[PDB]
Each structure stands twice: as structure tokens, then as C-alpha cells.
Symmetry: D2
Subunit: 368 residues, 4 copies
């Protein structure tokens, strides 16, 4: 039978989830999910967006969305603030959960959520857009197949400039409670999701951070920016391999520059999300023709064929979310494991909070 969907939130990621749920069966076949309940505030906004998004109804009561008998799975995309409350309420109501990163603002809340998930017998997945591109998934498979030999180094970054303007006003997100981590939270967690998928688990971090714009306008006065604008870290993976890692929300000229490369004993892979349809692969070759290959995204890569049969017809950012919906759909059907669930996700939260601790204490942080 068709999956009954509830959606909480309609912003950047809320509407992304909505577009995804709308076309998951168009792309992948099977039964179209039923868009049952959309929750958002104010109520008039929830009603108007429910209409245009195609949800059977809208409400300002998020608990209605998680408890409706016709709902099987809940997409949660509202402020990180109430993620634990909403996710745990949905699991308690017997609903599968698609939770936008982060799990919660602290490791402690994430730990409790992880335990609730294991008790509920429902499927969970954390929204990690950037692990779903055909280019990224192709890279993981190429590494798995030995295309670059043994990985010997990872270098990744995630630069954007959405906070570079110092006139941008203060908000609750720039506080430790209310907001949690800064660039590490909004960007770093995404890079960690990609990094651990490529290199395996993180064994140790040593990090440094900075707040470049330390105070911002707050209507007459100013208030202090409490979380980091940028951070960098050196990594040791559980394999013993090295890594470099960074993120920034003040890196002028960058808009979605999640970029990484894996250097191996027999090749190199390189990617930049601002050009998400290109994957660069070097493997040793005859001297006359030796050099990096530009692999342009097409049907040979995971997921792409469900969207288009011809290569070079660029896959979009939003289609990453359709792929993510499908993974959850199949996991609910018992036809495939979804990653990361709340257990896998908690590890990612531990890593990013470990980097924040390292930057503050000046000490390396180790993981089991």
C-alpha cells in the first residue's frame, strides 16, 4: 500500500522534502506516497502550502502530523531546537522518521534519540543531501572496487558565505543553547557524512576554530556571536589514514562548496558540489595520455537512470532528496538498509562535537 506521509516545516529543507515525496514514485516506480499532513506555523501558511504542495491538509499542530493514523512516516525539518521532542514523539506514535540534520543540538539529546529509535522498531534516516548524488555514490563504489587502491589521504572543505556580511543581524542560532554549533553544525556535519562514507570511521581529531564576526546588530544594540564562523581539523581514521577537514560560513564567493578528494595508492578522486555532475578520477596511465578524467554524471552512476536516460543532462540538488526518499521508502519495505539511521547519525554528532571540544581545549579528541 502507499506510504502515508507527514511533513513538519516548509523552509529550505521542508520544501525540498515536499518535492521529493511528490516525485519519488514517478522516478523509482511503485506506489506514490500519500501526502497526508503538512505541519507549519502560522496556520494560514500551513494551509496555503499544503494546497500548493498537494498535502491533503495543513495544520499548525505538529503533534497532529506525527499522530495521524493515516501517517506512516514523518519528515521533520523545523528548527533543530525541537528535533528531539518531535523525533521521539513520532517514534513513540509508531512512525518512521526522516530527520533533517542535525539529530539535536547536543550529543546528550542525540544519545537519548538513538536509544528511542532502537526501542521503537521503526526505520530512521538523517537527511544528508550530499551523500545522495550519483557522482558521490559512484565515488564510493569506485573506492570499494579498488579503483584508487588504498586510500592514503582525505582533504575536504565546505565553504559558504551566507554569514560573511557583518551587517546580517544576530539570531538565536548564534547562541550555544538555541543554536548549538556554528559552521560545524550547519556545514561540518555534512562534510563528516561524506568523509566517513569515503574513509570509514574517525578515530581522532585535532581542531581549531574562529569567530570572525564576533558581534552583530540586534535592533538598536548588538549581541555576541557565540558559535564559530569557521573551523579546521586534522583527522586520523580508524584505518590509520590521515585527513584534513574544514568548514566556513564566511568564505566569500562560495555558495555550496562542499569539496573533497581522496588520494590513494593507485589513484585520486576529486569532487566539488558546486559542480555536482563532475567527478575527477586519476589512475596511472601511459605517459603520452596520462591525466585526470572528467567523469560527467550519467546513467552509469547510482540513481541517475531513474531521472534521465542520457548522460550529461545535469542531475540537480533537489533530486538528491528524491534519492534519499527512495532509500527510506525501500528501507521501510524491508528491501534495503538506509544510512545513516539514528545510530550511524549519533557517531557523526560525536565527531562534530569532538571537533568543537578539541578547538576549545586545545587537545586531540579520540573516539572509542
Amino acid at each position: 500500500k502507499a506510504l502515508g506521509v507527514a511533513l513538519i516545516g516548509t523552509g529550505f529543507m521542508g520544501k525540498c522534502h515536499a518535492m521529493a515525496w511528490r516525485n519519488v514514485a514517478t522516478a523509482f516506480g511503485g506506489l506514490p506516497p500519500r501526502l497526508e499532513v503538512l505541519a507549519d506555523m502560522p496556520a494560514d501558511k500551513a494551509h496555503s502550502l499544503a494546497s500548493s504542495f498537494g498535502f491533503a491538509r495543513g495544520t499548525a499542530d505538529w503533534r497532529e502530523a506525527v499522530s495521524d493514523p493515516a501517517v506512516d512516516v514523518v519528515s521533520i525539518t523545523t528548527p533543530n531546537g525541537l528535533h528531539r521532542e518531535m523525533a521521539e514523539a513520532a517514534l513513540a506514535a509508531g512512525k518512521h522518521v526522516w530527520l533533517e540534520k542535525p539529530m539535536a543540538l547536543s550529543v546528550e539529546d542525540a544519545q537519548a534519540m538513538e536509544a528511542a529509535a532502537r526501542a521503537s522498531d521503526r526505520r530512521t534516516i538523517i537527511g544528508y543531501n550530499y551523500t545522495r548524488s550519483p557522482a558521490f555514490r559512484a565515488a564510493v563504489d569506485l573506492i570499494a572496487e579498488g579503483a584508487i587502491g588504498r586510500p592514503i589521504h582525505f582533504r575536504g572543505m565546505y565553504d559558504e558565505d551566507y554569514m560573511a556580511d557583518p551587517d546580517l543581524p544576530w539570531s538565536w542560532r548564534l547562541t550555544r543553547k538555541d543554536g548549538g554549533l556554528g559552521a560545524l553544525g550547519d556545514l561540518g556535519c555534512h562534510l563528516v557524512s561524506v568523509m566517513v562514507s569515503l574513509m570509514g570511521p574517525v578515530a581522532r581529531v585535532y581542531a581549531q576554530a574562529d569567530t570572525v564576526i564576533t558581534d552583530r546588530p540586534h535592533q538598536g544594540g548588538t549581541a555576541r556571536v557565540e558559535n564559530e564562523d569557521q573551523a579546521q581539523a586534522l583527522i586520523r581514521f580508524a584505518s590509520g589514514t590521515s585527513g584534513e577537514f574544514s568548514c566556513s560560513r564566511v568564505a566569500r564567493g562560495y555558495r555550496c562548496r562542499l569539496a573533497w578528494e581522496v588520494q590513494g595508492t593507485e589513484g585520486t578522486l576529486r569532487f566539488d558540489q558546486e559542480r555536482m555532475n563532475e567527478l575527477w578520477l586519476y589512475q596511472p596511465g601511459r605517459p603520452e595520455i596520462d591525466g585526470f578524467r572528467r567523469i560527467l554524471t550519467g546513467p552509469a552512476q547510482p540513481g541517475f537512470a531513474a531521472f534521465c536516460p542520457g548522460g550529461g543532462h545535469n542531475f540537480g540538488f533537489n533530486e538528491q532528496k528524491v534519492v534519499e526518499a527512495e532509500m527510506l521508502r525501500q528501507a521501510i519495505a524491508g528491501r534495503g538498509k538506509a544510512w545513516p539511521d539514528f545510530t550511524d547519525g549519533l557517531t557523526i554528532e560525536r565527531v562534530i562535537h569532538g571537533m568543537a571540544t578539541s578547538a576549545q581545549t586545545g587537545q586531540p579528541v579520540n573516539f572509542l
Copy 2:
């Protein structure tokens, strides 16, 4: 009330239209179109895809679908010259038409369609989806605004390699009777759609063409390839301005390389569809910083903000079709003109056929 939709065909473009119709209101607001009837063959396939696409019913008879009283607009997406009969039948039934290229194989048939469209007083649009990218629409606006001065030269190409391998079998597409034009028909029409939107109408062409792989495998023997693998032409626009134009279905390594540039008296614009989120702009600057700008697609560009609030989250090929659906939707409502209708579309047919004729005769062809 919401627009009632009929869809004919389910391949490359059929699925693309279906995804567009499903998310058009999600992206742009208003009422979601009602997916009423899907027509395809065989019947079991029409029924299977109606279910997964979310259409109320499938049918093996398209004539049924176009006359359904619950239908207001008909998407015609067969990868075929066989569009005249379906297009005119829809218009005759008082339905608006979203037609995939070409209008027909012959200019004569396209001309009949153009007249039926005017007589019908229903809206029409041809699926020239490469005119819908935020980057392309931004370029047109920059030109209109005087950002590069007066255009002095156009250079465009559309290379792909889907027929490059001589091993690839013969098919009816390679006949003049059933396939019509070659590269000019498959790819050239698209380049013309973009070119004339940038530079204005074509006054004259002088062209060359080649069939470089003259025979292909066919049922244990070979059959002759009757249309062109590639073609090039020098253009004069009605403006008096010069142009260069090419297309190829045998250009090894290229997958969707619709690439163009407009050189003006005060700057230059350059674009490549394989990187559809980048627009290159040169305008004179102080010597120390002078150079082309990489304009990364974001909410400053037409259409983008309906899909994502943050720049650099790559807009995709399929989202062009959502934009196209919205343009038609607004034209139906009487709140904008959709381009190109069958009148504008006919001109495109005349141009590609004029290029083909010029290549065959070795003489220039005039259009005005």
C-alpha cells in the same frame, strides 16, 4: 479550478513532463494540476505508469485522452515526428498543447499545425527546454539591459555522441522518411531555439553537413544511414550580425554540450549546458582585476528561487521542464505569453530545414 492534464508518451520526455506537472505548484504555488489521463502502448504499460506517475487512469487510445472533458491541457511527448495528428486533434478538442519537438517532419505539416493553432484560440508551447535554465534566462536579461553592448557575434554548438560508435545499429531514425533530419533535427532545433532567443531572427544560412558513418549493422547485414551525423553553418541574423552554428550526434566525449557565446561591443557571455549552473560574463574592468566572472546560478536568476533559496545548489535538467510547465500554466491563465508557440516554433522548423537544404544544394538559403 486546477488544470486537468493528459499525457501522451512515457519515455525520456514523458517522464520528464510527468515530474514537471507533479511539482509545478510545489515550486511556483497555485493549485496542483490534476493528472487525469496517461496514454501509452501497450495498455498494461499505460496502466503501470499511470499508477507510478499518479495519473487517475491509463489508456491505450490517445484519442480518448485528448477528448476527455476532465482534460484542459495535453502533453505530447512521443520521441517522434508523428505529432501533427495528435497536436491538431487536441486543439480541435479545445485543449491547450505542450508539444515536444519537432512540430512535424516536414515544414508543410508544421505550417498546417501553425494555422490550426491560430484558429483554435488555445495556447501552445514547444518543449525547447534549454531556454528555461536560470543561467540562460539571466543571459537574455543581461543582453536586453545592455550589459554586453550590442551583440557583434554568436558562436554556438550542440555536440553529443549517442551515435558516435560505428557499432551502434541502424534504426528507422536514420531514414529520411521516418526519421527526417539527423543531427539538425535531434540537436540543431535546440541550438536554434537558444540562438534566436539571444540574437533575434535568422535572415540567412550557409551550411555544410556530413554522414560520417555511412552504413550500420542491421539484422546480420548493413543498412544505409540517410541523414546527417553533423552539420555546420554560418549565420546572418536580421540584425545584420554574424553567427557560427553546429550540431553533431557523433562528437566523441560530449553528452549534452549545447554551448554558446555572445560577443558584444561591451562584453561577452558564454555558456555550456554540461555545466548549466555557470554563466561566464566579461565586461571591461580596471587592469589589475580584469577578467571573466563565473556567475554561479542562484536566486538572482529567473526561476531559481522557486526551487531553492540559497545559491549554488545546482539547478537540474528536469527542473527546466518545471519552469516550462509554469510558463504554459501562466499563459493559459492569461498572465504571460509562453514561448515558443506554434507560430514561433514554425520559424525554428524553417531554419533547421533551410540549413539542411543549404548543405544539400551548396547554396545559401534566405529566410526574409
Copy 3:
């Protein structure tokens, strides 16, 4: 004995020749050419630049440089209108000639020079330095080896913007009588040298052209620009293969964008001179890894190893000229034929002037 060198001109290409002759033996071995006489105007400039360039003396009289007993080879880098006179004089005096393109202002003059060169039994080479990069030369070898299969299309361009500003003053270079061709002369000839080296001889052209800025400032008033700012042409090669060709001196944002592509039945090669150290090669590959390769210039490519042992240490524009000098030195010594000599070069002049005629008359031109 070391080659005795005369140099006429000290501008863009004159100084490029001077730097090349100075280090040709440093790169390639053998005896360093002797820099004997530098000719330039005015005399004070010739003396000054001779000193800094390392030439034994400078003179204001090009005839002195050509006739000097210690001179064996003459580099001619002066205005196109004097090329025939200077080249013929050098040949008549028994000197080998390195002549900057073009040969002359007319096909008629180029023919006379071609005849004079054969009459003389001295070596000649025309200075088409874009045929000298390791990337270009590697591409020619890859095509010969079958790396892209059978070539089926050529597409080339040469955009620059040195004349894009309409306030840039008029000069005699912009008349047909004294300046000759416009963009076709300054840029087109370079693209032809590359194009024919890749694709073989041209059989036919059909061209269009424009002068975008028809009048320019001249000493408070205005004067007419008589030659083209841009031109485009469709090509048929002697092989039967198709081509696209263009040039422009008004293409805003481009500085040395000589760019070309050869598409073949088993691959594609693509190049852009603004990134002269990269050659793009597509060949079929398994679907998981299929794509163009970025071949970064290194010691695997012709000429590079004479300048650097390590790949990725970018080869420079000026080092193309060092390669060109060595080709001439080896030709003079009987150890290699240099291309293009005045005979090969005459064909290039015929092609560029045929394009100009085609654009003027609106008719194709056959060769």
C-alpha cells in the same frame, strides 16, 4: 662554427626572437649562436637594446644587419609591408631567414619570395610559434598514432580583444595598401598554420567578415578602418573533412584564445592556448570511468624535456620560440627539415587571402 645571428626589430616578436636565440643552445646543446647585429629605429634604441640583448652592436639600418659578414641567419620581425624586401635581400646576400608571419601583404609578393627562396639554397622558416608547444606537437603525434581514430571535424578559433576599444587610435595597419588583412592577417594566419598541421591542406572555404569599428581617432579627427575585425569560415579539407574557422581582434575578454578541437571516430582532442599546458583527450572507456582526460604538459611531450625534467612546470609562450629556433638551427645543419618554409608558407597565404576574397564576394573559394 656557431651561427651568426642578425635580428631586425625589437618589438613583441623581435624581443621574443632575441630571447630564443640567447638560450637555444642552453636548452638544446651544441654551440650558442652568436648575436652579431641588431637593427632597429631610432639608432639610440638599437644601441641600447643591442647592449641589453647581448648583440655585439646595434644599427638603425636593417641592410647593415643583413649584409654583415659575421651573419649567417636573419630574424625578420618588422612591419608586414617590408617583409618581402627584407627577406629577398637576406636571401640574395646568402643568409638563411627566420621570417615572422606573414610572408608579405599579397599572395603575389609571397609567390616572388617563394621563388627567391628556392633560387637561393638557404633555409627559410616562417614564425608560426603556436605550432611549437609541447601540447600541440603531442596532439599531432596522437592523431598520427590513431588516438582519435579518423578525424571527422575541425573547429578552431582565435579570439583576442586588442582592438575592442573604439578609442584606440587609427594606424596605417588598418589600411589595405599598407596594413594588408586585418584579423585574418594578425590571427587567422596563426589558426591556419595550426589547422593545416592538424588536418592537412584546405580545398575550399566559404567565409563571412565584419568590421565592427569602421572609424577610429586620427590626430584629432577620424580615419576609416579598411580591414576586417573578425571573420568566420566553413572549411572543406583535401581529405573531404569539414571544418569551422574564426578569428577576431574585438572579442572582449580574450587575450590569446587560439583554441581548436579535432573530433574523430574514436576520440576528440581539444586545446586552448590561454591554457597552453593542457591538452584534452577523449577516448572510449568503460562506462564507470568514461570521460575526457586532462593531459598536463610534461617530458612525455615533444620539446618539453629540453626545458624541464619534471611535468607540470608550465612551459611558456616564449619557449615556443626557443623550439622554433632549434628547428631552424637543425635545418641549417642538415639534420631536419623546418616547417613551414617559404613554399609551405605560400600555401598558408593563399588560404587566408582566399578567405578574405570569399568574405568580400559572398562566394566560396577553391584551392
Copy 4:
């Protein structure tokens, strides 16, 4: 005219020779006199003296450095002879152009730095990546406030000349006789660029690895003692952060010295494999906002001496002609050359500090 001595004729040796030959061609003044070339064996010194245009070849570098017709000495030999040759030149009253490194050990470099000040001669270290018109233009742009205040540096120097595990073991792979690995071959160059952009390094925390631990030797295997790759987090004297790496086993990279400076009002980005491009972002109106590709041309320092028209790509070897000119002008008292043995010592301290941090697992302060 400057009397030139040249010691060594391999990669850098020829590069120096080509530079000395064209330095006056490009920049004017008097062509330096190519007096004595020293190398071994004797036949090679004479052969190359002839093709390089030096008045004579010799197998004894000591006689070349003490020659009265010599004013300046280019030293391009193996790292293990740099101290001896450099101090001998300075003691003979000759100016010195020295290829990196100053020496294998910081202790030796310090002694060299002492001798340099006491000799009153000019010294320059061959950090040629600081000589490109693009790099020099970047420094000037930062000085004009084009990107505001620098807030982060990220740099790398990847190459793959040791990536093939079948490449034989050599003395260069010994701590004793090769010194540092990737940090010495590549790291030093990245430091020269980094401090030129960001000022002095205050602190580093580093990691390193030997990826290929054993290599074929005579009958077989011998252990590799120095690092194939290293990374570090940087704190500059300014307080600004940095990321730093180098590798000799990064497959596909040939000369990927790449750096980026992010500031409060813009970003600059560069990659030596495309040394004629400098990427600059500054905020712009929404419709046209984005990075600019600045193609190297006569607006950039040094370029016009080589070509009057932009986009005619400046090459690696021309960086060395620029370096030669800077030394010449320093000798003539018309401009100070960087880095001298004093500035050079600081660079040795940083790279060795990074090596120490990686070995001990502790940050190192300067």
C-alpha cells in the same frame, strides 16, 4: 657587468643558466658575464660550459668560487653540500644565489645565517614560486585591501614523483643524508608562499605519513625513513588560521602548489599547474556576482619584461629570470631581495617544526 659562477648543471643548474642569460634581455642593463661553470666529471663541466655559454668549465668548485672575475655564485648542487659551498662563497666575498634548502639541519642553516650577515654580501634562496606575476599581483592586491583582512589560509603542494612503489630506494629517503621528505622537497616552497601572503607562523600542529615504507634496493628492499606526506594546522603571528599540506605521492598531481586566502571582503585562489590564472572574488551586484579569472598579463609584476600582450603564458623558467633580476637589483642597492639567509632560516625552522610536531604529536610554537 656581474661576473657569474654556476655550480651544478642538473634541473636547477640549467634553469639558473637560462635565467642569467636572459635577465638583461628581459629587464635591461648589462648582461651578466658567464665566467665559470663547475660540475663533475670534468668532461661534463666543459661540455656544458660550452652549450651554456660560460667562459670555462671546471671540476673544482672551490677555484670557481674564489675566481676574481666572479661576483655572484649560483649554487644548485645536492642539499648536502649547500652549507660548505655557500659559506666558502661568502668568505671569498661573493654574493650567493642558493637553491633550497639552506642545509639539512637547522643548526647548519643558523651558522650560514651568521656568516651571511658578517660577509656583508647579498644572499637569496631559490623560492621561485614567489616570482610569478600572479603571485606577486596577489600580494599587491592584499596590500591594497582587495580582500579586506585575511581570515584564513589554505595551501597544498601535491606531486607524485614518488607515488610508484617500485621506484628504487635512494640516499634521499634517509633521515641522515636526505633529511626531510615531502616537507623538504615541497613543504618549504609552500611555506615561502604562505608567509609571503600571511606573515610569520606562530604555531603549528602536524601529522605525517610514510605511505611506501619499503622500496627496491640492489637485491631488494630498504626502508624509507622520511615522510611521503604531511599536513598541519597553522596559527599565524596575526592570529589568523591556516591549513597546510604537502605530498610526494599524490597521484595525478605534478606541480600542484595551490593556495587560497579568504578575507573579510574577498577571496584569492591560485594553482601553480595553471600559473597564469589568479581567482579573485569581491562582493558584486547580485546579477553579476562571482569570482573573476584574472589571466596573467602586463598589469602584473614582472610580466611586461617578457611580453607586451596579456595571455601569452608566463612559464616556470621565467620565474627564475625574475629571481635573477631581484638578486641583481639587490647587489646594485636598488631593492632588497627576499628571502635572504635570515628570512630563509625562518622557513627552515617552520618546516622542521612541522616535522617535530608530527613526530611528537604535540604542537610546536615559534
